[PDB]
Design a protein around this ligand. Structure first.
Ligand SMILES: Nc1ncnc2c1ncn2[C@@H]1O[C@H](COP(=O)(O)O)[C@@H](OP(=O)(O)O)[C@H]1O
Ligand SMILES: Nc1ncnc2c1ncn2[C@@H]1O[C@H](COP(=O)(O)O)[C@@H](OP(=O)(O)O)[C@H]1O
Lengths: 293, 293
């Protein structure tokens, strides 16, 4: 463990990558998908864990005890995750998992195993406004010891803006995933929409996944996957991980679960600078993020 | 025409209704919706025409020339409108219109054709503060010859407060439509938010309508749907109606276009009596109206 903890990011295909995840990349590259695999793809801290539980519920017809068959890391493995000696890798877990497999990933489009495009796999891409992500990712690096130490918020926001963070730039991640939406079966969702109206957003996932679930099951999914519920659910709140991987005393994994929390952290000067870069990166795209609800 | 001009309101389902519209309700009740119809529903005088032009622009990807294919009454017909001999009825017009159809209505939730709920049609409900609505509706009755003469402003405000106006009580209208948003895909909007921040409000409509528009197109919609531009737009300013329907010389349809205009008409005595009725009607509800920005 001493060799992966708090280490510098390594570049893999031009992307800064968590040191623990950066070895044997050949295995990821060559991963074999099944045509009924369902990918949930997000930039980090964008609501992956939230929507993994929603999807597991949908696929289990809202049966909560089925959703309690294991920890989230077993039900919905992160494809690119490795912590050898400490944990089954994501791909090792996935090769033991029954179809249809839910696969979580934060990979950029050009790093996703091509098998997933080739098997025409259904994908849910979820995105969250860049300001809330930077704040959530900052606190994440406080508690997750696989990450480099983030420094001060001021130092961290500058790395985030220039893409000097694990998985690289949020702008490029979001823009390149959005572009793929035209030639693949990808449902593109916003975190803020899920926060404001989970029923209508969950219905989009239900239709995308070719399921019909009645209003009682839907209400149960909404209730089971609410922040207050999930935060106390020990199968999903990440307290099952070794303290050497995640120390929740520094920041809880389930932290605030809100839109607009970034305003508690951004100075007005940081905000002006951030808005200027954002307009440069995003004005020409059809993406329309909300930074509060 | 002399048969429907300046006539008393007629009761339909316990709602006072413009005499001209109070006929052939069977036709309205049995209207056939299409799954992609877009309902814009409002209490009268709440920004219907404004939001109609916005949605038309959104659906046409910001193409102003396409937005010039016809007058607003043809582009975005009023469902329950009938001016027989003088105008194609709203429903006749809708049955001539290609999908996706935008459908305008001031109908209370209980009078909306059932077909719209059954088809799961997207709806945008726009609401405006009750004081600005009352002033706006007063002025409208001056110019609109289908309406009864409203009397003095003092006599009119008393009818408004007691719901003795076409489409009945504003309080019931907004409360029941707000309740509905928990059971149907309904984007509920505030006139005063659109006025303060049209960019953000328009982004909600773009998302809700599942459209892909960049910032150039967005700024273009904001400009083309500003008050100053629309009031001079002969296709939306309602100057195409017969003088027998609308005499703009009494009061222009595109009247003031602002939040807070009510302060020019309300006496201090009226305002106290209004506020007391308001609190009785509205203090339980989660709605939050601004009377100025
Ligand atoms: N049920 C839920 N509702 C809302 N947000 C949730 C949630 N479950 C997790 N989250 C939030 O999603 C973010 C984590 O994303 P990921 O799973 O992609 O790591 C965290 O945000 P905050 O740090 O802003 O609280 C976390 O609190
Ligand atoms: N582009 C625009 N911007 C702001 N307000 C607008 C608008 N177009 C119309 N309105 C206002 O919407 C009201 C009429 O609404 P409806 O279309 O629902 O009858 C009028 O309010 P005022 O009488 O306060 O001017 C009108 O001036």
């Amino acid at each position: 463990p001493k060799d992966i903890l708090r280490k510098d990011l390594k570049l893999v295909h031009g992307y800064p990558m968590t040191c623990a995840f950066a070895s044997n990349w050949e295995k990821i590259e060559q991963f074999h998908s099944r045509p009924d695999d369902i990918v949930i793809a997000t930039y980090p801290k964008s609501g992956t864990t939230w929507v993994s539980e929603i999807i597991d519920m949908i696929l289990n017809d809202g049966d909560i005890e089925k959703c309690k068959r294991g920890f989230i890391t077993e039900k919905v493995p992160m494809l690119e995750m490795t912590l050898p000696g400490l944990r089954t890798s994501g791909i090792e877990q996935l090769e033991k998992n029954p179809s249809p497999r839910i696969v979580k990933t934060h990979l950029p489009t050009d790093l996703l195993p091509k098998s997933f495009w080739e098997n025409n796999c259904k994908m849910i891409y979820l995105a969250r406004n860049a300001k809330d992500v930077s704040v959530s990712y900052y606190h994440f690096d406080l508690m997750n010891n696989l990450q480099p130490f983030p420094g001060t918020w001021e130092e961290y926001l500058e790395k985030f803006l220039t893409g000097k963070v694990a998985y690289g730039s949020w702008f490029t991640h979001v823009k390149n995933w959005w572009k793929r939406k035209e030639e693949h079966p990808i449902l593109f969702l916003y975190y803020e929409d899920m926060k404001e109206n989970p029923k209508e957003e969950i219905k989009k996932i239900i239709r995308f996944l070719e399921k019909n679930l009645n209003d009682e099951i839907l209400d149960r999914i909404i209730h089971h996957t609410s922040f207050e519920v999930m935060k106390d659910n020990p199968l999903v709140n990440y307290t099952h991980l070794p303290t050497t991987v995640m120390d929740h005393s520094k920041s809880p994994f389930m932290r605030k679960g809100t839109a607009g929390d970034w305003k508690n952290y951004f100075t007005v000067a940081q905000n002006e600078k951030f808005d200027a870069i954002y307009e440069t990166e995003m004005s020409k795209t059809a993406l329309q993020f909300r930074t509060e609800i």
